[PDB]
CSV table of C-alpha atoms and ligand atoms in Angstrom, one decimal:
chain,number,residue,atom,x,y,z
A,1,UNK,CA,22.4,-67.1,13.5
A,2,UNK,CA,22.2,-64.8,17.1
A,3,UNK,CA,24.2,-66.5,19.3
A,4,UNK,CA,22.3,-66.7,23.1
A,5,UNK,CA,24.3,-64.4,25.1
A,6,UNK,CA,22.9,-61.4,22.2
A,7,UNK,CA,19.4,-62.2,23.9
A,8,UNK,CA,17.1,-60.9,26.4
A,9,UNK,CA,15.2,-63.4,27.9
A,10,UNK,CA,11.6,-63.1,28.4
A,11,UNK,CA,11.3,-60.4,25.6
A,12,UNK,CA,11.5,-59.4,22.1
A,13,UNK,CA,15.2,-57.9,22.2
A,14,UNK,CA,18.3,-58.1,21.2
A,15,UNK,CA,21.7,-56.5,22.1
A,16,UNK,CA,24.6,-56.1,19.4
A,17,UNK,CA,23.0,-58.3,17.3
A,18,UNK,CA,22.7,-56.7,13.8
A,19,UNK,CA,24.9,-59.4,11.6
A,20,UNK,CA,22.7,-62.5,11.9
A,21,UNK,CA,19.7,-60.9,9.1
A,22,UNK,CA,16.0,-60.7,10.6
A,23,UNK,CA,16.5,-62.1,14.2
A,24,UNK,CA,13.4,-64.5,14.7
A,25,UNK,CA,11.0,-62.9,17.5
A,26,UNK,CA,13.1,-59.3,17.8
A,27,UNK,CA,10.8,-57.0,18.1
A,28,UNK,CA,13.6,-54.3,18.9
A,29,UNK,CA,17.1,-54.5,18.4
A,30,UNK,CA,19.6,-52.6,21.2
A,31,UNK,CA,22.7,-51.2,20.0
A,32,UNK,CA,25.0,-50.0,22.8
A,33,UNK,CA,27.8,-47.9,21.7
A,34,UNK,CA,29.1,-47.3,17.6
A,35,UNK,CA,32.3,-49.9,17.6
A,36,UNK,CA,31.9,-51.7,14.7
A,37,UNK,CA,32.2,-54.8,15.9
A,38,UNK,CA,28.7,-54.1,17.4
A,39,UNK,CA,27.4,-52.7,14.9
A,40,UNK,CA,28.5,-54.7,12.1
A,41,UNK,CA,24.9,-55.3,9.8
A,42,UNK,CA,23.4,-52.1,9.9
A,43,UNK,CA,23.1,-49.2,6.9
A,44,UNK,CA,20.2,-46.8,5.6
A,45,UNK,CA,18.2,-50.2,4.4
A,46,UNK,CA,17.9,-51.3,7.9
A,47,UNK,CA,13.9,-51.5,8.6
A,48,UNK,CA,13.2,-52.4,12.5
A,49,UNK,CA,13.5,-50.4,15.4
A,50,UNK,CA,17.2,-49.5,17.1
A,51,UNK,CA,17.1,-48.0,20.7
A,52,UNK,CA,20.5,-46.3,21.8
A,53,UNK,CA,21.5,-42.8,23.5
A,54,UNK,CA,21.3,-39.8,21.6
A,55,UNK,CA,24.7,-40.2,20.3
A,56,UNK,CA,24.7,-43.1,19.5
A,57,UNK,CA,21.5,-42.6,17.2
A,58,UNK,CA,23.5,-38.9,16.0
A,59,UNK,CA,26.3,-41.2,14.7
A,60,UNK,CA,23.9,-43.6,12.7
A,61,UNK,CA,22.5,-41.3,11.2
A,62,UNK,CA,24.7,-39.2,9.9
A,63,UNK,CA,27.7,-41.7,9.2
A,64,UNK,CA,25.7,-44.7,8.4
A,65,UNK,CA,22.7,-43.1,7.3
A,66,UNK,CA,20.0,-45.2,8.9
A,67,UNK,CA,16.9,-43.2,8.5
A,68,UNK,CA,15.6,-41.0,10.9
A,69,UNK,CA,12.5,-43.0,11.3
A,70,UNK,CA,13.7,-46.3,12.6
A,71,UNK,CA,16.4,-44.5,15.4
A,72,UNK,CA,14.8,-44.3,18.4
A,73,UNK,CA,17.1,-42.4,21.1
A,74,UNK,CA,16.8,-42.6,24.9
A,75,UNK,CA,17.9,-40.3,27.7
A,76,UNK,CA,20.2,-41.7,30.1
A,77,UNK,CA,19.4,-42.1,33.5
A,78,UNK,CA,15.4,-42.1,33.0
A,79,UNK,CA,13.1,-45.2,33.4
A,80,UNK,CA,11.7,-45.8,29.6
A,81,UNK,CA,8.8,-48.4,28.8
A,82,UNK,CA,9.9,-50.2,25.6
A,83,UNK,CA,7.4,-52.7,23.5
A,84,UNK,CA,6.2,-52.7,27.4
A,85,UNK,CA,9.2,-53.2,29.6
A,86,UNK,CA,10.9,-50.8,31.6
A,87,UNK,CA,14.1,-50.2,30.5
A,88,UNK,CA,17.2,-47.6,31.8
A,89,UNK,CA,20.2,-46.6,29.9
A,90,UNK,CA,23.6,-45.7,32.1
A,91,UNK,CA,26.6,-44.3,31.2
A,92,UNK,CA,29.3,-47.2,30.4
A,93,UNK,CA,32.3,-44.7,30.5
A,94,UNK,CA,33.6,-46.7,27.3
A,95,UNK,CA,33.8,-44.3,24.1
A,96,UNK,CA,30.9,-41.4,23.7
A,97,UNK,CA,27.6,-42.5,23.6
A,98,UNK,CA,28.0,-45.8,25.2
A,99,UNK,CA,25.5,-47.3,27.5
A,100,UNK,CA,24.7,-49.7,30.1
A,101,UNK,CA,21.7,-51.3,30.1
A,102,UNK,CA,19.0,-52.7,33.2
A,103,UNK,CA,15.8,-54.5,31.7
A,104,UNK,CA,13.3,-55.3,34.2
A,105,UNK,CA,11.6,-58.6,33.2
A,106,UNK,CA,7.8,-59.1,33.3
A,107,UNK,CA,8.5,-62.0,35.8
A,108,UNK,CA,10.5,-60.0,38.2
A,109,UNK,CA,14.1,-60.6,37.3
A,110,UNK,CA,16.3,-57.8,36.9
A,111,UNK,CA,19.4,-58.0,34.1
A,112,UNK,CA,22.1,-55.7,33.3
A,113,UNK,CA,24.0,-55.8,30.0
A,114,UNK,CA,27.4,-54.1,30.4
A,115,UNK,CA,27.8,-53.6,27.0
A,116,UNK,CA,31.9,-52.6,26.7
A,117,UNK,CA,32.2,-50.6,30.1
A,118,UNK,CA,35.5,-49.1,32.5
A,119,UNK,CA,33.9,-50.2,35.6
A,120,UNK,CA,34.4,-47.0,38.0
A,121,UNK,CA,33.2,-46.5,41.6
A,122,UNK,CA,30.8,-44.0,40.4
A,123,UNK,CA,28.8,-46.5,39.0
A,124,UNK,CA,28.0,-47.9,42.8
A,125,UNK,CA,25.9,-44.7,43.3
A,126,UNK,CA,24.0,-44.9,39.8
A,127,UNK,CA,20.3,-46.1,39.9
A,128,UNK,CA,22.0,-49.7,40.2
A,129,UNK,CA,22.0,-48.9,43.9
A,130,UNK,CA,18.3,-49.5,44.3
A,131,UNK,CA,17.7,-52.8,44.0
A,132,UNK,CA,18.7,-56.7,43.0
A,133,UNK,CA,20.4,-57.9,39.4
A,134,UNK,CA,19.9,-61.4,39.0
A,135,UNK,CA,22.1,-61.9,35.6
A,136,UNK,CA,25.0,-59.7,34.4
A,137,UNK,CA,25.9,-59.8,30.7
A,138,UNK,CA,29.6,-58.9,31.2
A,139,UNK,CA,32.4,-57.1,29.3
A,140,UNK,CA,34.8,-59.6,29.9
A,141,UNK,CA,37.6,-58.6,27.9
A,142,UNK,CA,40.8,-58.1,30.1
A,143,UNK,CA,39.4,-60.4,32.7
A,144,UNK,CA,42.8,-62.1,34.3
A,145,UNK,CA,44.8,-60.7,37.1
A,146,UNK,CA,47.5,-59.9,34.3
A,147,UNK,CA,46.0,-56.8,32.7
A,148,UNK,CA,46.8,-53.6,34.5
A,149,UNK,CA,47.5,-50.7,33.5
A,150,UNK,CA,47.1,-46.9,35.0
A,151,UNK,CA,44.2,-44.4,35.4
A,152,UNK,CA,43.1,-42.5,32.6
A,153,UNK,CA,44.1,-39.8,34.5
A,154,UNK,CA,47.9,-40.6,34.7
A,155,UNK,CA,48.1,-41.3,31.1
A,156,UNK,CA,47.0,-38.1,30.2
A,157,UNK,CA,49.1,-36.6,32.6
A,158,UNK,CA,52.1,-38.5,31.2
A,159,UNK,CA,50.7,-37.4,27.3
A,160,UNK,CA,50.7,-33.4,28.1
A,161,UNK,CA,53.8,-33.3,30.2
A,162,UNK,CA,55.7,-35.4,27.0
A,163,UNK,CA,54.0,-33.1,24.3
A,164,UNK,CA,54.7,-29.9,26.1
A,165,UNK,CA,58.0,-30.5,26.6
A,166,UNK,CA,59.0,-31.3,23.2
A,167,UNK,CA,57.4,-28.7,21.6
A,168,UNK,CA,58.8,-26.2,23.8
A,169,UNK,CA,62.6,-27.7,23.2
A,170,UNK,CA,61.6,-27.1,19.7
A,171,UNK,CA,59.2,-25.0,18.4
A,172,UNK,CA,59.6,-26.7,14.7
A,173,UNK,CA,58.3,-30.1,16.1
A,174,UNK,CA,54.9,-31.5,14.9
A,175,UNK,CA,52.6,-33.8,17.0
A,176,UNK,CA,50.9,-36.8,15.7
A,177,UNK,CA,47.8,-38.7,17.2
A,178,UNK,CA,46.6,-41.9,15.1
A,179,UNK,CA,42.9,-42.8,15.2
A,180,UNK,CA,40.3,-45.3,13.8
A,181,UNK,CA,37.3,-45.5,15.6
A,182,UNK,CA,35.7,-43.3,18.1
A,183,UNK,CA,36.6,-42.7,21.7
A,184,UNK,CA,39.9,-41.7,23.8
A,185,UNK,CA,39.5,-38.8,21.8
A,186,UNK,CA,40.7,-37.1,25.7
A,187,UNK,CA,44.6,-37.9,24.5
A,188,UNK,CA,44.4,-35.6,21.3
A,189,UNK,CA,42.0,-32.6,22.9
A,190,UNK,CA,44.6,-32.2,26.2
A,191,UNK,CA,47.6,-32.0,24.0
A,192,UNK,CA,46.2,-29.9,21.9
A,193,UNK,CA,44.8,-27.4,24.5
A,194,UNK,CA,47.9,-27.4,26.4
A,195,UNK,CA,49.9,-26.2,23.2
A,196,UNK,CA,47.6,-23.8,22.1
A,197,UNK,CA,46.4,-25.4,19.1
A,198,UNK,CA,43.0,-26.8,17.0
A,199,UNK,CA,43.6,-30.7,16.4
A,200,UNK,CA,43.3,-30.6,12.6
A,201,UNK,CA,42.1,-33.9,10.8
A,202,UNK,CA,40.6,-35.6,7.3
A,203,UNK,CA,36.6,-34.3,6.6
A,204,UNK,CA,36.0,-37.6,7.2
A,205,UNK,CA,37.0,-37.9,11.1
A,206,UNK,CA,36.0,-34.1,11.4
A,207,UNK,CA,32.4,-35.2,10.2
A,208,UNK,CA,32.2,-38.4,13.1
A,209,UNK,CA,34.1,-35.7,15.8
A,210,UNK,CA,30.8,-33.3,15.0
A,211,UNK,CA,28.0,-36.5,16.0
A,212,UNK,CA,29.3,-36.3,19.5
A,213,UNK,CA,28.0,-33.4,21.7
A,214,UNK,CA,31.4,-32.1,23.1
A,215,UNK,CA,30.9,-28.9,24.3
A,216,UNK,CA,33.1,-26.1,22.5
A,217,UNK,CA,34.0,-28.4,19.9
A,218,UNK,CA,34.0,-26.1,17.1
A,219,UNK,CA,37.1,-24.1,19.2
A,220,UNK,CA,39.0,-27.6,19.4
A,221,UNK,CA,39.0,-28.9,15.6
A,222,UNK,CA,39.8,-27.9,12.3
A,223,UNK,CA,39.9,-29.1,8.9
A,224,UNK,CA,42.7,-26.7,8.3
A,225,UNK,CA,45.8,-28.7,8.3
A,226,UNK,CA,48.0,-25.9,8.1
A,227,UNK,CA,46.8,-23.7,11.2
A,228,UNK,CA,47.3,-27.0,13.6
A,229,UNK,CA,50.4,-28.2,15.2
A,230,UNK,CA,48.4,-31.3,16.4
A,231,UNK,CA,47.3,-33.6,13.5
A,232,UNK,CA,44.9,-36.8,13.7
A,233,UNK,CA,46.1,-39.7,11.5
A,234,UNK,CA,45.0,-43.1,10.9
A,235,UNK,CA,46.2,-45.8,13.1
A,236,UNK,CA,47.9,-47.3,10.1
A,237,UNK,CA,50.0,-44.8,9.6
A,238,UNK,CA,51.4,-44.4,13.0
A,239,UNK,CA,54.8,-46.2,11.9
A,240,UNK,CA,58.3,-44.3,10.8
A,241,UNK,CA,57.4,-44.8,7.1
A,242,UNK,CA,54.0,-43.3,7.3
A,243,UNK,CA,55.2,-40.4,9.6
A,244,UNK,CA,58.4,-39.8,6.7
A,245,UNK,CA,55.6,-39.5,4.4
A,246,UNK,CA,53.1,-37.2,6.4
A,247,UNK,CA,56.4,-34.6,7.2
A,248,UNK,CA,56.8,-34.3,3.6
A,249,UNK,CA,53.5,-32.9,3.0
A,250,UNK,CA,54.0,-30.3,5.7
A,251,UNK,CA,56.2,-28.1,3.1
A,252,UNK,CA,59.1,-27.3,5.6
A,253,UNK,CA,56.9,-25.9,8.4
A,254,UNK,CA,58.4,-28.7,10.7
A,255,UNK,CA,61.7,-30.6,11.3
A,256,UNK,CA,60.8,-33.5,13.8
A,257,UNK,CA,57.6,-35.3,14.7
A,258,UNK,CA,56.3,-36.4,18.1
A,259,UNK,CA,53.4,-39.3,17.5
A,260,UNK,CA,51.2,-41.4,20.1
A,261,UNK,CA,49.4,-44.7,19.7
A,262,UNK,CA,47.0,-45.0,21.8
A,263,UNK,CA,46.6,-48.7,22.4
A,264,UNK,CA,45.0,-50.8,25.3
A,265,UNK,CA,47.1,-53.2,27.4
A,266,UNK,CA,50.2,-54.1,26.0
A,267,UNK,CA,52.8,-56.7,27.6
A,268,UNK,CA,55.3,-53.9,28.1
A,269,UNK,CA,52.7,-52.9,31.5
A,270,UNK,CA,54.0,-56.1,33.1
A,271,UNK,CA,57.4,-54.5,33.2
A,272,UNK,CA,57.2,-50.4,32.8
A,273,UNK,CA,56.2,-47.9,35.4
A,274,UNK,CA,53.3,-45.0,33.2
A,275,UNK,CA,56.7,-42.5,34.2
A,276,UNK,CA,59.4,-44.5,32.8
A,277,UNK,CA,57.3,-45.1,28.9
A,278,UNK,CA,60.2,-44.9,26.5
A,279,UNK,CA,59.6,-44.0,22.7
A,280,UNK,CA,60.6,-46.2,19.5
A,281,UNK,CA,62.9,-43.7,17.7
A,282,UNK,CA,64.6,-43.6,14.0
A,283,UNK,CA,65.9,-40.1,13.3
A,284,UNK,CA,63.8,-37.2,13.5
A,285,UNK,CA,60.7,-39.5,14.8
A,286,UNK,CA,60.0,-40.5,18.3
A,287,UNK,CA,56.5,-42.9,18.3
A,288,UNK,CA,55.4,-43.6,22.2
A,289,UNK,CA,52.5,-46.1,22.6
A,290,UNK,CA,50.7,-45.2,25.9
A,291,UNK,CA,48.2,-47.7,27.5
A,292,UNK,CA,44.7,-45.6,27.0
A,293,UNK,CA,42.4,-48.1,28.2
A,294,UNK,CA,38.3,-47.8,28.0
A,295,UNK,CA,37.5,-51.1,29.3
A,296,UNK,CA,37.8,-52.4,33.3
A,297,UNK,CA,41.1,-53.7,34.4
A,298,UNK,CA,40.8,-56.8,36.4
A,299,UNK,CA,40.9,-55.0,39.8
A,300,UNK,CA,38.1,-52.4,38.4
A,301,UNK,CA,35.9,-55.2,36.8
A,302,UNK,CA,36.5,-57.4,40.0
A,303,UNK,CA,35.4,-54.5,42.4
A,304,UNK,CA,32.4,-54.1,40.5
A,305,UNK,CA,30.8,-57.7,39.9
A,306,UNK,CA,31.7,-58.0,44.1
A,307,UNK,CA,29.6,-55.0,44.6
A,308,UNK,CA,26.6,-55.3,42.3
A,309,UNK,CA,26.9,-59.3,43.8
A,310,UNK,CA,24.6,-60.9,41.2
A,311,UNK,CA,23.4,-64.1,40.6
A,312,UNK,CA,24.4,-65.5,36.8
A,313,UNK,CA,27.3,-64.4,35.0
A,314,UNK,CA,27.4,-64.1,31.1
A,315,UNK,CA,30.8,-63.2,29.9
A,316,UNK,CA,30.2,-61.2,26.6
A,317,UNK,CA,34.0,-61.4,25.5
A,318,UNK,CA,36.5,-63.6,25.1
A,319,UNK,CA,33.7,-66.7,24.7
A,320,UNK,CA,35.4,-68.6,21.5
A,321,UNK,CA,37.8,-70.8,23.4
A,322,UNK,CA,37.4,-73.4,25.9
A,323,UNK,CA,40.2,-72.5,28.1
A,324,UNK,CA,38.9,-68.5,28.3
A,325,UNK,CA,35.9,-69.8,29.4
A,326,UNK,CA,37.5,-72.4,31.8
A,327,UNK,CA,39.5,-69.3,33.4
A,328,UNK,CA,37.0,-66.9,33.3
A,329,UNK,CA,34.2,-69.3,35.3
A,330,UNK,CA,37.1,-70.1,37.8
A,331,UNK,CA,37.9,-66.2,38.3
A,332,UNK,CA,33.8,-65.6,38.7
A,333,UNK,CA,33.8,-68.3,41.7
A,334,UNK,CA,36.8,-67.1,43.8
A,335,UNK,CA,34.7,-63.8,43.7
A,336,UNK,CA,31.8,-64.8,44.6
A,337,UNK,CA,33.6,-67.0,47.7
A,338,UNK,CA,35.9,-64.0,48.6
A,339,UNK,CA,32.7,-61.9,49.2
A,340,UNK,CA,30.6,-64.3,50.6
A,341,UNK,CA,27.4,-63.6,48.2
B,401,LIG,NI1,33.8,-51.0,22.1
């Protein structure tokens, strides 16, 4: 059964919420970004209405094969009437595709669903400038004072500078990027422009790269193996046995690899400086795990929810346990009396 915090009250919608079978009363189920714990339900015998961006709709139908009929894409940025509500998609800066979304109620209330989101300053000069929210459904996810981590920006930086300098040490060295779902696809595309290459990858991930309306993207990827000194691998397989295994294949073109894992926070950011990252190393394999985040930090996420000041709270993440609810209520309250709203 749809838990409450997948609903919309006051309509016929849903967000997320294609898991729970026919959801009594939807009339049109929201899907915000292709993750699959969001998606997890949907397939090409899916037979109600789903409203997402263009990408988002690109990616179900060509990887899930929903048919073309029941995908109904929105622009972003543009006030849409749906089942008769206005409705507005936003960019989430999460992975491509992903959206905000502001429902404006029949009664007057005004909601915004985050969806998964990296709360940016930008955002405070969207359309959310214009008026009130009363109730913000919230990406919650690294909401405690804990999780930092650097900009996007700095990571990359970091990514290029390590890639560039390895490969120019030793032009016999191979580059590694794991994978398994879509977005920071930013930390394979810089390395691989900075060294001159295509990224070269399975059909499989070249087929999902192809939904997403990159511009030039045909110059950037391959499913030549052999022309590309940057190859996309499974997550999985970003690990010194896997990585043994992958050289092997490469029939003496290369005599060291140089692989990243992008992860999100890891406990190593309470301690290490983006500058003074370190690799795991066992021979010929050096495996760096760099904190590529795509949701809010607490200081982003904080900044936000003080500036869009609204009135109700729902955390979307993080809800199972009594004590992350506990600490997430007591963090939305020091905000709210910090500010003075
Ligand atoms: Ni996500």
């Amino acid at each position: 059964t749809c838990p409450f915090y997948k609903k919309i009250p006051g309509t016929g919608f849903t967000v997320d919420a294609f898991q729970y079978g026919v959801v009594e009363g939807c009339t049109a189920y929201f899907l915000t970004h292709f993750h699959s714990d969001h998606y997890a339900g949907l397939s090409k015998h899916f037979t109600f209405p789903v409203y997402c961006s263009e990408i988002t709709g690109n990616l179900l139908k060509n990887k899930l094969h929903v048919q073309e009929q029941y995908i109904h894409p929105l622009p972003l940025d543009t006030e849409c009437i749906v089942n008769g509500v206005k409705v507005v998609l936003l960019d989430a800066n999460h992975c491509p595709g992903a959206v905000m979304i502001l429902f404006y109620l029949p009664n007057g209330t005004v909601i915004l669903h985050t969806g998964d989101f990296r709360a940016d300053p930008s955002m405070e000069r969207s359309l959310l400038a214009d008026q009130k929210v009363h109730m913000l459904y919230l990406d919650t996810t690294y909401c405690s004072p804990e999780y930092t981590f650097p900009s996007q920006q700095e990571v990359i930086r970091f990514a290029i500078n390590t890639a560039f300098e390895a490969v120019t040490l030793n032009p016999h060295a191979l580059v590694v990027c794991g994978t398994y779902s879509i977005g920071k696809e930013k930390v394979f595309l810089a390395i691989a422009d900075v060294l001159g290459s295509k990224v070269g990858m399975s059909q499989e991930k070249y087929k999902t790269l192809q939904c997403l309306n990159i511009p030039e993207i045909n110059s950037l990827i391959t499913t030549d193996m052999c022309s590309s000194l940057v190859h996309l691998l499974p997550m999985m397989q970003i690990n010194f046995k896997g990585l043994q295994s992958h050289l092997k294949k490469c029939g003496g073109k290369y005599n060291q690899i140089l692989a990243f894992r992008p992860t999100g926070w890891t406990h190593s950011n309470k301690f290490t400086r983006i500058a003074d990252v370190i690799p795991q190393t066992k021979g010929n394999i050096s495996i760096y795990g760099i904190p590529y985040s795509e949701h809010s930090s607490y200081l982003e996420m904080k900044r936000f929810v003080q500036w869009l000041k609204p009135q109700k709270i729902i955390p979307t993440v993080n809800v199972g346990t009594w004590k992350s609810r506990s600490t997430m209520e007591k963090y939305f309250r020091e905000w709210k009396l910090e500010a003075g709203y």
